[PDB]
């Protein structure tokens, strides 16, 4: 057997999934995995505009080279806070990981076939793997606007605790973090927690979400992420792993515990070992030897010989992150664990190729891929695998990555399909799980419930659509799962229908009506209907549709044939009048009395089969006889026999129905004499007689034949009996009119309310006037359920009695998931945080606009290092790389452009006035980060006057140790519009000795101006008369992150400045005896239209004149 | 002696001011920030330095985290798969994040002392 | 510690009406960031316009003058006199409720630092 393994095999009984690609349920996730699609997409701006953080170089400061991810297509802020009893403020404070974890755990509990009430208060454990808690940073990046419940809402631990808090669980609630392996590690812990027996159930959950750039920037700093945006497992294109948003929850139990609880099994986690990488070549580097040892130890613990193919796993959900350094290690570990100890290959496929590397939940994700696969006998393919990586090829001999949905390899008979899951978290925590397929060696009302009537209506709609989509599913199993294997919730509704069409139409009626009930009460009072209320053709559908009812009818027939020969048999109404199609009227005593008695006997037997605990009050005629059986003291056979033999009232304080010219009068008095004479030779529940007012409300005094005579002779004080029953049992909850509703409804309920002043106890009929018998009884059960949850009655026992063949299956797997309200988006975003996640592109030379910027005040923040600005290496002064003053000028002009765009203005002209360069930014090394903060404040916004005055200051900080200082300052005067401006140049100053550009820059370097590459772009120059002119390359500069050109390449403007020195000094003269740096620019003035036109024209070579005004 | 053995690690950390202080400004974030500040690494790095191969969980059950780790370590020691198990815990005050968050719920003591009972 | 992060953990007191100086501030450019809600400013409930609690224009003026004080202190200067010129109140801050947070960012940039003058 599968339960004989050394360690008790844990079992996945249910799962709840929020996976990318609209995979909001395990079925959709399996469909995606076996039929993968290009799920990955650009990080939606709704989450955070990664383009505001994207840069081709991953190691670029404050950028990420992976602008793609396998993101969920759902609004994570849309959360059913009302469902989980979480207030709006707290729900907003919550980490979307926690909210989706709650939703997925409820989905997994539902799919496993468990009521939240059943698990409520139990020792269920929780183990959540979370690694990428963008919330607690996004919601807390700006400490202001932090909500009151932020602490618990975003705390990593709460991710687990809150789950158990909502479900009232008392088991361990760990929130694990072993990086990518976290969730799988959680499974292991859960497995351990399940093998101790201290927790009958354990949620193993995982959550990774993409809410902020923090994780992207951090991982891209190490180049961990895939710039291509896909986790190309073991492929030659392996360049990292693509982050994926996924929240998984898996209900785990010991196989024996699941079986004894009758929970449908998704798979069997036979063993889950966890090991760690030693002192590998780097903390991030995985170890093949460690993973091989993990696999071998896990198989040994499972009792599986790694060398034996029978004990081997035919599928292996590998970590498969697409990391060029990690994938080869994993392949080597797999090969050396399952091989290398000496012919179908051992299929290896990572779910992260389809749903992405989901970090914390990645393990669980792989587990799901291993679970569904092993359950469906299909080896899911890998979306991204085109060419085996050369590093992985040596270990790929015995391995094959499936590119197609491959049928499971042939197995020895009796051996379950076996798969393996590997998840390695950076740091080296490796979790390995061995999973297998579980070898598996009249209808109830369709009940729905939700925390809100809106959710209940959506549930009705979804169930109608599901029935339309799945008419093949057995209705009995569906209703039994909805009753016994689905949670009960405050807002309740129940649908009555014998077949799929009937239940669908009843669902339509319920949806149109919108009538639902809101908010351990199985106490019912059995009010038994009597003669004169029997309807034609009662039990015709029940008898002809329920074999249990047919067996009851056979017992009634046997009792009928047990009558004295004088009265044996009263002609069988059970086969003459309880017939479909005929529906003959039954008013004759000989048939009407036993007909009603049999109706009530069958109905009460069905109710007891549902384990409904009864209090009994007799009616009149048949209503008494059947009630005598309901007392638990008289056999049903005796009751029906007495009814047949007899065949041959004060209902309420305001109702009296004594009748005559008949029963309770002399008309039937004489026939009562011989009848009783025959009844003498022919024959637990609180039970109260009404035929006898008070005396015969006792167990021993109700068996006398004189009582059965009084049944038709004595007047019936039904009101008094009801009063007695409801006053001696004030704790009574509901009452059921067993038999022919609505004969006794109004007077009985009125009597109940009168006796219990103002206590309108629930009332329910089970066989209406001319209605379908199955529908009538199902509506009675529906009322019971809508009133008292699952405690009203037991459906499992009812189906144990009714239709013993084909025991109901927990089809909760296929039932629609709970329709989470999602009406309100619970999220936290300080407008600074929103401008941070969102906002403009990280403009070159400027970086990102400050979160606290305004249309009137701006602060572009950047950390310039020369290697991140390829051309910046060209501006060197005294050897040190120095940020050009032209750099500050271009920064100011680009800031002016961005400000004008913020006001939807096009700058016709851009002057820079009274500019001063206070402190040259010295770069110690090409990798040194110097902070540049350009603060630009529009002191005048006179677009009405067509002008904009903006005081600008480029503050600089060379090293984080020092404070922020002023690098440059000035003003900007923008001539703007809602979308020849400069004097024509002088007449190309006549005679100018041709300055040897090479010699000019050689002398400049001799004087410390070590200009290089782009800053030697002075094509030609010629100087004379304290003047210079010529042509300099107007080399274009464009922001790759924005895809648009800049006004000026600081190299070109710095060359223009060098023209001033050239006019001042000729090559080889040494008039430039000291290194002059631009300190104070009285007025720059740029025509942005012309500069952009020249940059895009391709000539990128413009003429220049320059006067060395002061020398 | 422990180098290369199956020693486990279970670290309880709740108040990771680092990964926020060092990452509040995404610029200036060092290259090794990912693994340096990642909560999980808190355990893994330990086993990485000591060349341990046992489980390296980094637990977070709020104030109980470290003790929970002990339990897990205890379990890991009762399975026999690890001859030794570090049960560690770490709470540090490097940023106001935790203080502001907890004070928002008034969890912290304004007097500055945990006056038990 | 990014120097912005250092100025965040460290730095001046959270001056009333101003909050905390922005991490990316300078001796020449400053940006005090605050999230004013009336209950956190006990007296602010007194300034109501059409029933709604409105941040006084005098509030903006006092914010500007306190910013001037802090700027002078940053330059180790004592303000003998403090004029506010061409001041304009463009949008009155309407507080929906005493617990509503309205972000106020006072950006003050010393266009002229002529302490010599």
PDB file of C-alpha atoms in Angstrom, chain A residues 836-1043:
ATOM      1  CA  UNK A 836       8.002  56.860  -7.011  1.00  0.00           C
ATOM      2  CA  UNK A 837       6.545  53.620  -8.385  1.00  0.00           C
ATOM      3  CA  UNK A 838       4.950  55.621 -11.262  1.00  0.00           C
ATOM      4  CA  UNK A 839       6.208  58.871 -12.753  1.00  0.00           C
ATOM      5  CA  UNK A 840       8.392  59.996 -15.640  1.00  0.00           C
ATOM      6  CA  UNK A 841      11.248  58.084 -17.184  1.00  0.00           C
ATOM      7  CA  UNK A 842      14.576  58.380 -15.343  1.00  0.00           C
ATOM      8  CA  UNK A 843      15.773  61.219 -17.535  1.00  0.00           C
ATOM      9  CA  UNK A 844      19.468  61.022 -18.336  1.00  0.00           C
ATOM     10  CA  UNK A 845      21.656  63.545 -16.504  1.00  0.00           C
ATOM     11  CA  UNK A 846      18.702  64.055 -14.154  1.00  0.00           C
ATOM     12  CA  UNK A 847      17.613  60.671 -12.905  1.00  0.00           C
ATOM     13  CA  UNK A 848      14.176  60.354 -11.364  1.00  0.00           C
ATOM     14  CA  UNK A 849      12.096  63.365 -10.413  1.00  0.00           C
ATOM     15  CA  UNK A 850      11.766  63.608  -6.647  1.00  0.00           C
ATOM     16  CA  UNK A 851       8.666  62.010  -5.166  1.00  0.00           C
ATOM     17  CA  UNK A 852       7.771  65.332  -3.508  1.00  0.00           C
ATOM     18  CA  UNK A 853       8.034  67.401  -6.689  1.00  0.00           C
ATOM     19  CA  UNK A 854       5.351  69.747  -8.007  1.00  0.00           C
ATOM     20  CA  UNK A 855       4.423  71.402 -11.305  1.00  0.00           C
ATOM     21  CA  UNK A 856       5.971  74.514  -9.732  1.00  0.00           C
ATOM     22  CA  UNK A 857       8.904  72.844  -7.937  1.00  0.00           C
ATOM     23  CA  UNK A 858      10.965  69.884  -9.128  1.00  0.00           C
ATOM     24  CA  UNK A 859      13.977  67.954  -7.866  1.00  0.00           C
ATOM     25  CA  UNK A 860      15.568  65.405 -10.186  1.00  0.00           C
ATOM     26  CA  UNK A 861      17.663  62.951  -8.173  1.00  0.00           C
ATOM     27  CA  UNK A 862      20.520  60.985  -9.718  1.00  0.00           C
ATOM     28  CA  UNK A 863      23.702  59.189  -8.659  1.00  0.00           C
ATOM     29  CA  UNK A 864      26.058  59.671 -11.592  1.00  0.00           C
ATOM     30  CA  UNK A 865      29.014  57.338 -11.950  1.00  0.00           C
ATOM     31  CA  UNK A 866      31.183  57.644 -15.079  1.00  0.00           C
ATOM     32  CA  UNK A 867      30.785  54.028 -16.210  1.00  0.00           C
ATOM     33  CA  UNK A 868      26.993  54.403 -16.160  1.00  0.00           C
ATOM     34  CA  UNK A 869      27.402  57.485 -18.389  1.00  0.00           C
ATOM     35  CA  UNK A 870      29.634  56.123 -21.139  1.00  0.00           C
ATOM     36  CA  UNK A 871      30.687  59.532 -22.472  1.00  0.00           C
ATOM     37  CA  UNK A 872      31.360  61.061 -19.043  1.00  0.00           C
ATOM     38  CA  UNK A 873      34.783  59.389 -18.976  1.00  0.00           C
ATOM     39  CA  UNK A 874      35.901  61.878 -21.633  1.00  0.00           C
ATOM     40  CA  UNK A 875      35.813  64.929 -19.340  1.00  0.00           C
ATOM     41  CA  UNK A 876      38.940  64.636 -17.210  1.00  0.00           C
ATOM     42  CA  UNK A 877      40.612  67.497 -15.341  1.00  0.00           C
ATOM     43  CA  UNK A 878      44.047  66.847 -13.835  1.00  0.00           C
ATOM     44  CA  UNK A 879      43.440  63.161 -14.563  1.00  0.00           C
ATOM     45  CA  UNK A 880      40.334  62.987 -12.391  1.00  0.00           C
ATOM     46  CA  UNK A 881      37.050  62.547 -14.225  1.00  0.00           C
ATOM     47  CA  UNK A 882      35.069  65.730 -13.559  1.00  0.00           C
ATOM     48  CA  UNK A 883      31.435  66.390 -14.370  1.00  0.00           C
ATOM     49  CA  UNK A 884      31.492  69.097 -17.071  1.00  0.00           C
ATOM     50  CA  UNK A 885      30.043  72.523 -16.444  1.00  0.00           C
ATOM     51  CA  UNK A 886      28.393  71.889 -19.792  1.00  0.00           C
ATOM     52  CA  UNK A 887      26.964  68.890 -17.960  1.00  0.00           C
ATOM     53  CA  UNK A 888      25.301  71.155 -15.405  1.00  0.00           C
ATOM     54  CA  UNK A 889      24.040  73.397 -18.209  1.00  0.00           C
ATOM     55  CA  UNK A 890      22.543  70.462 -20.111  1.00  0.00           C
ATOM     56  CA  UNK A 891      20.982  69.225 -16.872  1.00  0.00           C
ATOM     57  CA  UNK A 892      19.371  72.624 -16.348  1.00  0.00           C
ATOM     58  CA  UNK A 893      18.097  72.754 -19.929  1.00  0.00           C
ATOM     59  CA  UNK A 894      16.652  69.237 -19.731  1.00  0.00           C
ATOM     60  CA  UNK A 895      15.009  70.206 -16.444  1.00  0.00           C
ATOM     61  CA  UNK A 896      13.518  73.196 -18.253  1.00  0.00           C
ATOM     62  CA  UNK A 897      12.225  70.858 -20.963  1.00  0.00           C
ATOM     63  CA  UNK A 898      10.638  68.553 -18.393  1.00  0.00           C
ATOM     64  CA  UNK A 899       9.082  71.496 -16.542  1.00  0.00           C
ATOM     65  CA  UNK A 900       7.608  72.860 -19.769  1.00  0.00           C
ATOM     66  CA  UNK A 901       6.241  69.414 -20.578  1.00  0.00           C
ATOM     67  CA  UNK A 902       4.717  69.289 -17.103  1.00  0.00           C
ATOM     68  CA  UNK A 903       2.863  72.491 -18.025  1.00  0.00           C
ATOM     69  CA  UNK A 904       2.225  71.182 -21.566  1.00  0.00           C
ATOM     70  CA  UNK A 905       4.479  73.938 -22.928  1.00  0.00           C
ATOM     71  CA  UNK A 906       6.967  73.798 -25.796  1.00  0.00           C
ATOM     72  CA  UNK A 907      10.050  75.926 -25.134  1.00  0.00           C
ATOM     73  CA  UNK A 908      10.668  78.186 -28.116  1.00  0.00           C
ATOM     74  CA  UNK A 909      13.797  79.508 -26.383  1.00  0.00           C
ATOM     75  CA  UNK A 910      15.789  78.476 -23.302  1.00  0.00           C
ATOM     76  CA  UNK A 911      18.091  80.997 -21.618  1.00  0.00           C
ATOM     77  CA  UNK A 912      20.239  80.223 -18.586  1.00  0.00           C
ATOM     78  CA  UNK A 913      20.965  83.388 -16.616  1.00  0.00           C
ATOM     79  CA  UNK A 914      23.545  84.190 -13.935  1.00  0.00           C
ATOM     80  CA  UNK A 915      24.602  80.549 -13.825  1.00  0.00           C
ATOM     81  CA  UNK A 916      27.412  79.703 -11.415  1.00  0.00           C
ATOM     82  CA  UNK A 917      29.395  76.479 -11.064  1.00  0.00           C
ATOM     83  CA  UNK A 918      30.315  76.465  -7.379  1.00  0.00           C
ATOM     84  CA  UNK A 919      31.946  73.041  -6.896  1.00  0.00           C
ATOM     85  CA  UNK A 920      33.241  70.819  -9.680  1.00  0.00           C
ATOM     86  CA  UNK A 921      32.138  67.215  -9.184  1.00  0.00           C
ATOM     87  CA  UNK A 922      35.304  65.112  -8.977  1.00  0.00           C
ATOM     88  CA  UNK A 923      34.826  61.404  -9.698  1.00  0.00           C
ATOM     89  CA  UNK A 924      37.363  59.317  -7.794  1.00  0.00           C
ATOM     90  CA  UNK A 925      36.787  56.353 -10.117  1.00  0.00           C
ATOM     91  CA  UNK A 926      34.520  55.370 -12.986  1.00  0.00           C
ATOM     92  CA  UNK A 927      32.439  53.314 -10.525  1.00  0.00           C
ATOM     93  CA  UNK A 928      32.209  56.080  -7.909  1.00  0.00           C
ATOM     94  CA  UNK A 929      28.681  57.396  -7.371  1.00  0.00           C
ATOM     95  CA  UNK A 930      28.303  61.169  -7.037  1.00  0.00           C
ATOM     96  CA  UNK A 931      24.820  62.322  -6.103  1.00  0.00           C
ATOM     97  CA  UNK A 932      23.413  65.098  -8.294  1.00  0.00           C
ATOM     98  CA  UNK A 933      20.125  66.697  -7.242  1.00  0.00           C
ATOM     99  CA  UNK A 934      18.852  69.321  -9.682  1.00  0.00           C
ATOM    100  CA  UNK A 935      16.240  71.385  -7.850  1.00  0.00           C
ATOM    101  CA  UNK A 936      14.351  73.647 -10.266  1.00  0.00           C
ATOM    102  CA  UNK A 937      11.653  75.979  -8.947  1.00  0.00           C
ATOM    103  CA  UNK A 938       9.653  78.044 -11.437  1.00  0.00           C
ATOM    104  CA  UNK A 939       9.658  81.422  -9.699  1.00  0.00           C
ATOM    105  CA  UNK A 940       7.483  82.774 -12.537  1.00  0.00           C
ATOM    106  CA  UNK A 941       4.979  80.832 -14.654  1.00  0.00           C
ATOM    107  CA  UNK A 942       3.727  83.470 -17.082  1.00  0.00           C
ATOM    108  CA  UNK A 943       2.696  81.288 -20.003  1.00  0.00           C
ATOM    109  CA  UNK A 944       0.076  83.981 -20.493  1.00  0.00           C
ATOM    110  CA  UNK A 945       3.080  86.260 -21.048  1.00  0.00           C
ATOM    111  CA  UNK A 946       4.859  83.368 -22.765  1.00  0.00           C
ATOM    112  CA  UNK A 947       7.636  83.211 -20.173  1.00  0.00           C
ATOM    113  CA  UNK A 948       8.852  80.928 -17.409  1.00  0.00           C
ATOM    114  CA  UNK A 949      11.529  81.847 -14.861  1.00  0.00           C
ATOM    115  CA  UNK A 950      13.000  78.898 -12.960  1.00  0.00           C
ATOM    116  CA  UNK A 951      15.714  79.109 -10.324  1.00  0.00           C
ATOM    117  CA  UNK A 952      17.790  75.943 -10.624  1.00  0.00           C
ATOM    118  CA  UNK A 953      20.483  74.446  -8.400  1.00  0.00           C
ATOM    119  CA  UNK A 954      22.507  71.314  -9.165  1.00  0.00           C
ATOM    120  CA  UNK A 955      23.528  70.185  -5.697  1.00  0.00           C
ATOM    121  CA  UNK A 956      26.318  67.620  -5.599  1.00  0.00           C
ATOM    122  CA  UNK A 957      27.675  65.131  -3.082  1.00  0.00           C
ATOM    123  CA  UNK A 958      30.879  63.353  -4.067  1.00  0.00           C
ATOM    124  CA  UNK A 959      30.601  60.541  -1.504  1.00  0.00           C
ATOM    125  CA  UNK A 960      27.824  59.347   0.787  1.00  0.00           C
ATOM    126  CA  UNK A 961      30.051  60.188   3.761  1.00  0.00           C
ATOM    127  CA  UNK A 962      29.804  63.909   2.995  1.00  0.00           C
ATOM    128  CA  UNK A 963      26.829  66.240   2.992  1.00  0.00           C
ATOM    129  CA  UNK A 964      25.005  67.507  -0.079  1.00  0.00           C
ATOM    130  CA  UNK A 965      26.760  70.564  -1.520  1.00  0.00           C
ATOM    131  CA  UNK A 966      26.089  73.025  -4.328  1.00  0.00           C
ATOM    132  CA  UNK A 967      27.701  72.084  -7.638  1.00  0.00           C
ATOM    133  CA  UNK A 968      26.027  74.757  -9.765  1.00  0.00           C
ATOM    134  CA  UNK A 969      23.219  77.297  -9.683  1.00  0.00           C
ATOM    135  CA  UNK A 970      21.452  79.749 -11.948  1.00  0.00           C
ATOM    136  CA  UNK A 971      18.150  80.745 -13.513  1.00  0.00           C
ATOM    137  CA  UNK A 972      16.253  79.553 -16.579  1.00  0.00           C
ATOM    138  CA  UNK A 973      14.181  81.848 -18.797  1.00  0.00           C
ATOM    139  CA  UNK A 974      11.943  79.799 -21.084  1.00  0.00           C
ATOM    140  CA  UNK A 975      10.113  81.427 -23.974  1.00  0.00           C
ATOM    141  CA  UNK A 976       7.286  78.938 -24.393  1.00  0.00           C
ATOM    142  CA  UNK A 977       4.170  78.115 -26.389  1.00  0.00           C
ATOM    143  CA  UNK A 978       1.137  75.962 -25.655  1.00  0.00           C
ATOM    144  CA  UNK A 979       2.466  73.158 -27.878  1.00  0.00           C
ATOM    145  CA  UNK A 980      15.809  83.061 -35.923  1.00  0.00           C
ATOM    146  CA  UNK A 981      15.075  83.152 -32.194  1.00  0.00           C
ATOM    147  CA  UNK A 982      18.771  83.987 -31.679  1.00  0.00           C
ATOM    148  CA  UNK A 983      20.973  86.624 -33.332  1.00  0.00           C
ATOM    149  CA  UNK A 984      22.732  85.458 -36.488  1.00  0.00           C
ATOM    150  CA  UNK A 985      26.389  84.613 -35.876  1.00  0.00           C
ATOM    151  CA  UNK A 986      29.101  87.103 -36.687  1.00  0.00           C
ATOM    152  CA  UNK A 987      30.623  87.029 -40.162  1.00  0.00           C
ATOM    153  CA  UNK A 988      32.912  84.025 -39.671  1.00  0.00           C
ATOM    154  CA  UNK A 989      35.802  86.060 -38.281  1.00  0.00           C
ATOM    155  CA  UNK A 990      38.024  86.682 -41.287  1.00  0.00           C
ATOM    156  CA  UNK A 991      41.587  85.507 -40.656  1.00  0.00           C
ATOM    157  CA  UNK A 992      42.216  82.864 -38.021  1.00  0.00           C
ATOM    158  CA  UNK A 993      45.318  80.698 -37.888  1.00  0.00           C
ATOM    159  CA  UNK A 994      44.219  77.084 -38.253  1.00  0.00           C
ATOM    160  CA  UNK A 995      44.454  75.649 -34.742  1.00  0.00           C
ATOM    161  CA  UNK A 996      45.875  72.136 -34.950  1.00  0.00           C
ATOM    162  CA  UNK A 997      43.143  70.326 -33.033  1.00  0.00           C
ATOM    163  CA  UNK A 998      45.503  67.526 -32.012  1.00  0.00           C
ATOM    164  CA  UNK A 999      48.086  70.047 -30.804  1.00  0.00           C
ATOM    165  CA  UNK A1000      45.354  72.131 -29.168  1.00  0.00           C
ATOM    166  CA  UNK A1001      44.118  69.200 -27.091  1.00  0.00           C
ATOM    167  CA  UNK A1002      47.701  68.101 -26.411  1.00  0.00           C
ATOM    168  CA  UNK A1003      48.443  71.493 -24.863  1.00  0.00           C
ATOM    169  CA  UNK A1004      45.113  71.405 -23.029  1.00  0.00           C
ATOM    170  CA  UNK A1005      46.089  68.070 -21.499  1.00  0.00           C
ATOM    171  CA  UNK A1006      49.486  69.521 -20.625  1.00  0.00           C
ATOM    172  CA  UNK A1007      47.549  72.158 -18.659  1.00  0.00           C
ATOM    173  CA  UNK A1008      45.332  69.542 -16.988  1.00  0.00           C
ATOM    174  CA  UNK A1009      42.456  69.491 -19.510  1.00  0.00           C
ATOM    175  CA  UNK A1010      42.681  65.773 -20.219  1.00  0.00           C
ATOM    176  CA  UNK A1011      39.732  65.839 -22.619  1.00  0.00           C
ATOM    177  CA  UNK A1012      39.077  62.543 -24.378  1.00  0.00           C
ATOM    178  CA  UNK A1013      36.773  60.829 -26.877  1.00  0.00           C
ATOM    179  CA  UNK A1014      33.506  62.782 -27.094  1.00  0.00           C
ATOM    180  CA  UNK A1015      35.114  65.884 -25.567  1.00  0.00           C
ATOM    181  CA  UNK A1016      37.754  65.949 -28.320  1.00  0.00           C
ATOM    182  CA  UNK A1017      34.887  66.336 -30.819  1.00  0.00           C
ATOM    183  CA  UNK A1018      36.169  69.743 -31.975  1.00  0.00           C
ATOM    184  CA  UNK A1019      36.329  68.920 -35.682  1.00  0.00           C
ATOM    185  CA  UNK A1020      38.275  72.039 -36.662  1.00  0.00           C
ATOM    186  CA  UNK A1021      39.110  75.407 -35.149  1.00  0.00           C
ATOM    187  CA  UNK A1022      40.953  78.566 -36.128  1.00  0.00           C
ATOM    188  CA  UNK A1023      41.816  81.508 -33.889  1.00  0.00           C
ATOM    189  CA  UNK A1024      42.942  85.121 -34.162  1.00  0.00           C
ATOM    190  CA  UNK A1025      42.302  88.609 -32.793  1.00  0.00           C
ATOM    191  CA  UNK A1026      41.307  87.192 -29.401  1.00  0.00           C
ATOM    192  CA  UNK A1027      38.687  85.138 -31.226  1.00  0.00           C
ATOM    193  CA  UNK A1028      38.086  81.627 -32.502  1.00  0.00           C
ATOM    194  CA  UNK A1029      35.737  79.876 -34.895  1.00  0.00           C
ATOM    195  CA  UNK A1030      35.334  76.666 -36.816  1.00  0.00           C
ATOM    196  CA  UNK A1031      33.191  73.542 -36.627  1.00  0.00           C
ATOM    197  CA  UNK A1032      32.500  71.213 -33.704  1.00  0.00           C
ATOM    198  CA  UNK A1033      30.608  67.927 -33.851  1.00  0.00           C
ATOM    199  CA  UNK A1034      27.074  68.421 -32.517  1.00  0.00           C
ATOM    200  CA  UNK A1035      27.141  64.793 -31.426  1.00  0.00           C
ATOM    201  CA  UNK A1036      23.609  63.690 -30.454  1.00  0.00           C
ATOM    202  CA  UNK A1037      22.782  62.309 -27.026  1.00  0.00           C
ATOM    203  CA  UNK A1038      19.591  60.349 -26.371  1.00  0.00           C
ATOM    204  CA  UNK A1039      18.185  58.676 -23.265  1.00  0.00           C
ATOM    205  CA  UNK A1040      17.945  54.960 -24.014  1.00  0.00           C
ATOM    206  CA  UNK A1041      15.373  54.652 -21.230  1.00  0.00           C
ATOM    207  CA  UNK A1042      13.239  57.317 -22.924  1.00  0.00           C
ATOM    208  CA  UNK A1043      14.101  56.815 -26.596  1.00  0.00           C
TER     209      UNK A1043
END
